[PDB]
Amino acid sequence: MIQRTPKIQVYSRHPAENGKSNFLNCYVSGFHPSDIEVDLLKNGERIEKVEHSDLSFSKPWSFYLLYYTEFTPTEKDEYACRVNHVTLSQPKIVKWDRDM
Numbered sequence: 001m002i003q004r005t006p007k008i009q010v011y012s013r014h015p016a017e018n019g020k021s022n023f024l025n026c027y028v029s030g031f032h033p034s035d036i037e038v039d040l041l042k043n044g045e046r047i048e049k050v051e052h053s054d055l056s057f058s059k060p061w062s063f064y065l066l067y068y069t070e071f072t073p074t075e076k077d078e079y080a081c082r083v084n085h086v087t088l089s090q091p092k093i094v095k096w097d098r099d100m
Contacts, residue, residue: 002061005087006031010080010096012073024096025068026081034063037084041093042077073098 006028013023028038034055040047050069057063073079079096 002032003087004030004032004062006036006065006083006085008081008083008092008094010094011100012071012096021070022072023068024071024073024079025066026083026094028065028067028081028083031063031065031085031087032061033086035086036063036065038065038067039082040067040069041080041082042071044078044080046082 007030009027009029011025011027013025015021015023024040026038026040028036040050047069050067052066052068054066055063067081071079075098080093081096082091082093084091
């Protein structure tokens with residue numbers, strides 16, 4: 001058996017073909033086993049509608065998840081990604097840096 005804790009990165013992107021739109025991304029990389037729970041949060045509350053969740057693997061034993069959706073942030077809103085996995089004794093919350 002092998003187990004690996006995911007790396008978690010949270011960031012925003014505007015698609016070049018429609019630059020007024022903005023997407024909040026959580027990229028969860030390099031993990032095993034593949035069982036996992038991932039949410040986007042707005043002011044501590046789970047975002048229910050997340051329109052994209054894309055899972056892949058490289059080696060048998062290494063998985064990658066991009067979990068993202070359109071949003072409209074304001075300066076007073078806090079956003080985050082919350083991940084649960086067998087390697088994590090409590091949920092890991094990674095905040096979105098409004099600059100990123």
